[PDB]
Design a protein around this nucleic acid. Structure first.
Length: 56
RNA sequence: UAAUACAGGGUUGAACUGUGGGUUAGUUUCAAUGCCCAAGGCAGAGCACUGGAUUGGAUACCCAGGGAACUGUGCUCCCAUUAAUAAGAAUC
């Protein structure tokens, strides 16, 4: 009984891993083939100064 | 603070790396204005200085002239000392 349970479990993992790797690399390929996005939003002029805990 | 040359910082994409760190002297750069020295000049401005006003008893307020001070690879940090009054980690 244990021989069949272990053998079947191995096949399920092999197929699942193959599909996961295929999609993982597909996304990275697209990112490395497009023009970088240049930021054009509001500047960070108010985030410079902070107000931490007063006193000690 | 349009053009061009040299070299930094910030945002995003891939690869690599696989705990590399926080604070910091017997330490080291930079640092407005003023002053000594030096280089200087032919513009726009003005401290000192007899150059036209004072008073209800005293004056630099209101014009004009006016040879110091205003670009430094230097000596150099006294101040109301340059983007708040904490250099870091955790709770969204």
């Amino acid at each position: 009984l244990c021989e069949l349970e272990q053998k079947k479990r191995t096949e399920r993992a092999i197929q699942h891993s193959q599909d996961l790797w295929k999609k993982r690399t597909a996304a990275k390929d697209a990112h490395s083939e497009k023009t970088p996005e240049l930021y054009d939003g509001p500047f960070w002029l108010k985030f410079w100064r902070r107000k931490k805990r007063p006193g000690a």
